[PDB]
PDB file of all heavy atoms in Angstrom:
ATOM      1  N   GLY A   2     161.520  38.477 -34.583  1.00  0.00           N
ATOM      2  CA  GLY A   2     161.598  39.839 -34.650  1.00  0.00           C
ATOM      3  C   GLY A   2     160.247  40.575 -34.632  1.00  0.00           C
ATOM      4  O   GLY A   2     159.212  39.975 -34.910  1.00  0.00           O
ATOM      5  N   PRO A   3     160.268  41.883 -34.277  1.00  0.00           N
ATOM      6  CA  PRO A   3     159.194  42.808 -34.571  1.00  0.00           C
ATOM      7  C   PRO A   3     159.138  43.293 -36.074  1.00  0.00           C
ATOM      8  O   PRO A   3     160.125  43.684 -36.580  1.00  0.00           O
ATOM      9  CB  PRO A   3     159.436  43.966 -33.596  1.00  0.00           C
ATOM     10  CG  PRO A   3     160.936  44.046 -33.488  1.00  0.00           C
ATOM     11  CD  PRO A   3     161.369  42.620 -33.659  1.00  0.00           C
ATOM     12  N   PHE A   4     157.948  43.412 -36.640  1.00  0.00           N
ATOM     13  CA  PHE A   4     157.726  43.849 -38.090  1.00  0.00           C
ATOM     14  C   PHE A   4     156.491  44.676 -38.161  1.00  0.00           C
ATOM     15  O   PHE A   4     155.558  44.585 -37.194  1.00  0.00           O
ATOM     16  CB  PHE A   4     157.607  42.571 -38.879  1.00  0.00           C
ATOM     17  CG  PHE A   4     158.599  41.527 -38.655  1.00  0.00           C
ATOM     18  CD1 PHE A   4     158.318  40.277 -38.021  1.00  0.00           C
ATOM     19  CD2 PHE A   4     159.945  41.687 -39.191  1.00  0.00           C
ATOM     20  CE1 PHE A   4     159.257  39.315 -37.843  1.00  0.00           C
ATOM     21  CE2 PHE A   4     160.968  40.675 -39.002  1.00  0.00           C
ATOM     22  CZ  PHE A   4     160.553  39.557 -38.287  1.00  0.00           C
ATOM     23  N   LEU A   5     156.360  45.439 -39.234  1.00  0.00           N
ATOM     24  CA  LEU A   5     155.107  46.286 -39.528  1.00  0.00           C
ATOM     25  C   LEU A   5     154.806  46.318 -40.907  1.00  0.00           C
ATOM     26  O   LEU A   5     155.682  46.341 -41.856  1.00  0.00           O
ATOM     27  CB  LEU A   5     155.319  47.612 -38.785  1.00  0.00           C
ATOM     28  CG  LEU A   5     154.059  48.557 -38.935  1.00  0.00           C
ATOM     29  CD1 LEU A   5     153.914  49.397 -37.727  1.00  0.00           C
ATOM     30  CD2 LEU A   5     154.253  49.551 -40.115  1.00  0.00           C
ATOM     31  N   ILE A   6     153.458  46.268 -41.289  1.00  0.00           N
ATOM     32  CA  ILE A   6     152.813  46.347 -42.615  1.00  0.00           C
ATOM     33  C   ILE A   6     152.065  47.667 -42.687  1.00  0.00           C
ATOM     34  O   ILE A   6     151.146  47.902 -41.807  1.00  0.00           O
ATOM     35  CB  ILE A   6     151.954  45.225 -42.842  1.00  0.00           C
ATOM     36  CG1 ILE A   6     152.708  43.822 -42.853  1.00  0.00           C
ATOM     37  CG2 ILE A   6     151.041  45.321 -44.138  1.00  0.00           C
ATOM     38  CD1 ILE A   6     151.775  42.653 -42.460  1.00  0.00           C
ATOM     39  N   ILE A   7     152.228  48.452 -43.686  1.00  0.00           N
ATOM     40  CA  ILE A   7     151.272  49.508 -44.056  1.00  0.00           C
ATOM     41  C   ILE A   7     150.600  49.227 -45.347  1.00  0.00           C
ATOM     42  O   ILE A   7     151.202  48.543 -46.258  1.00  0.00           O
ATOM     43  CB  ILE A   7     151.881  50.930 -44.153  1.00  0.00           C
ATOM     44  CG1 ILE A   7     152.947  51.239 -43.033  1.00  0.00           C
ATOM     45  CG2 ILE A   7     150.785  51.936 -44.033  1.00  0.00           C
ATOM     46  CD1 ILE A   7     154.334  50.810 -43.408  1.00  0.00           C
ATOM     47  N   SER A   8     149.265  49.466 -45.471  1.00  0.00           N
ATOM     48  CA  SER A   8     148.451  48.954 -46.589  1.00  0.00           C
ATOM     49  C   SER A   8     147.246  49.895 -46.787  1.00  0.00           C
ATOM     50  O   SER A   8     146.945  50.714 -46.037  1.00  0.00           O
ATOM     51  CB  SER A   8     147.922  47.550 -46.112  1.00  0.00           C
ATOM     52  OG  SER A   8     146.989  47.699 -45.024  1.00  0.00           O
ATOM     53  N   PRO A   9     146.608  49.726 -48.070  1.00  0.00           N
ATOM     54  CA  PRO A   9     145.384  50.496 -48.286  1.00  0.00           C
ATOM     55  C   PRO A   9     144.177  49.823 -47.680  1.00  0.00           C
ATOM     56  O   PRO A   9     144.068  48.609 -47.482  1.00  0.00           O
ATOM     57  CB  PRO A   9     145.189  50.363 -49.811  1.00  0.00           C
ATOM     58  CG  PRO A   9     145.835  49.060 -50.164  1.00  0.00           C
ATOM     59  CD  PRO A   9     147.016  48.907 -49.155  1.00  0.00           C
ATOM     60  N   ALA A  10     143.254  50.632 -47.104  1.00  0.00           N
ATOM     61  CA  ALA A  10     142.378  50.190 -46.036  1.00  0.00           C
ATOM     62  C   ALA A  10     141.499  48.902 -46.362  1.00  0.00           C
ATOM     63  O   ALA A  10     141.321  48.066 -45.593  1.00  0.00           O
ATOM     64  CB  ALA A  10     141.460  51.395 -45.626  1.00  0.00           C
ATOM     65  N   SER A  11     141.114  48.849 -47.668  1.00  0.00           N
ATOM     66  CA  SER A  11     140.295  47.708 -48.155  1.00  0.00           C
ATOM     67  C   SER A  11     141.021  46.335 -48.090  1.00  0.00           C
ATOM     68  O   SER A  11     140.414  45.296 -48.233  1.00  0.00           O
ATOM     69  CB  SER A  11     139.792  47.971 -49.541  1.00  0.00           C
ATOM     70  OG  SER A  11     139.082  49.227 -49.627  1.00  0.00           O
ATOM     71  N   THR A  12     142.376  46.323 -47.851  1.00  0.00           N
ATOM     72  CA  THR A  12     143.176  45.159 -47.717  1.00  0.00           C
ATOM     73  C   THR A  12     143.364  44.802 -46.257  1.00  0.00           C
ATOM     74  O   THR A  12     144.197  43.820 -46.039  1.00  0.00           O
ATOM     75  CB  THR A  12     144.503  45.241 -48.469  1.00  0.00           C
ATOM     76  OG1 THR A  12     145.329  46.195 -47.940  1.00  0.00           O
ATOM     77  CG2 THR A  12     144.318  45.529 -49.952  1.00  0.00           C
ATOM     78  N   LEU A  13     142.876  45.356 -45.315  1.00  0.00           N
ATOM     79  CA  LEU A  13     142.952  45.099 -43.812  1.00  0.00           C
ATOM     80  C   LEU A  13     142.082  43.897 -43.502  1.00  0.00           C
ATOM     81  O   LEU A  13     141.308  43.899 -42.474  1.00  0.00           O
ATOM     82  CB  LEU A  13     142.588  46.356 -43.022  1.00  0.00           C
ATOM     83  CG  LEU A  13     143.529  47.612 -43.165  1.00  0.00           C
ATOM     84  CD1 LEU A  13     142.957  48.757 -42.572  1.00  0.00           C
ATOM     85  CD2 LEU A  13     144.898  47.307 -42.516  1.00  0.00           C
ATOM     86  N   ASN A  14     142.108  42.820 -44.306  1.00  0.00           N
ATOM     87  CA  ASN A  14     141.442  41.593 -44.140  1.00  0.00           C
ATOM     88  C   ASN A  14     142.240  40.441 -44.671  1.00  0.00           C
ATOM     89  O   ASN A  14     142.721  39.569 -43.844  1.00  0.00           O
ATOM     90  CB  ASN A  14     140.029  41.750 -44.767  1.00  0.00           C
ATOM     91  CG  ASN A  14     139.113  40.470 -44.559  1.00  0.00           C
ATOM     92  OD1 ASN A  14     138.247  40.325 -45.317  1.00  0.00           O
ATOM     93  ND2 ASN A  14     139.298  39.777 -43.531  1.00  0.00           N
ATOM     94  N   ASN A  15     142.628  40.394 -45.903  1.00  0.00           N
ATOM     95  CA  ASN A  15     143.554  39.405 -46.507  1.00  0.00           C
ATOM     96  C   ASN A  15     144.921  39.474 -45.758  1.00  0.00           C
ATOM     97  O   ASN A  15     145.436  38.348 -45.560  1.00  0.00           O
ATOM     98  CB  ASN A  15     143.562  39.358 -48.022  1.00  0.00           C
ATOM     99  CG  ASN A  15     143.720  40.607 -48.753  1.00  0.00           C
ATOM    100  OD1 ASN A  15     143.887  41.808 -48.151  1.00  0.00           O
ATOM    101  ND2 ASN A  15     143.621  40.613 -50.029  1.00  0.00           N
TER     102      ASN A  15
END
Side-chain angles (χ1 to χ4, degrees):
Chain A
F4 314 104
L5 183 144
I6 295 150
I7 321 90
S8 71
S11 306
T12 66
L13 297 167
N14 185 205
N15 47 4

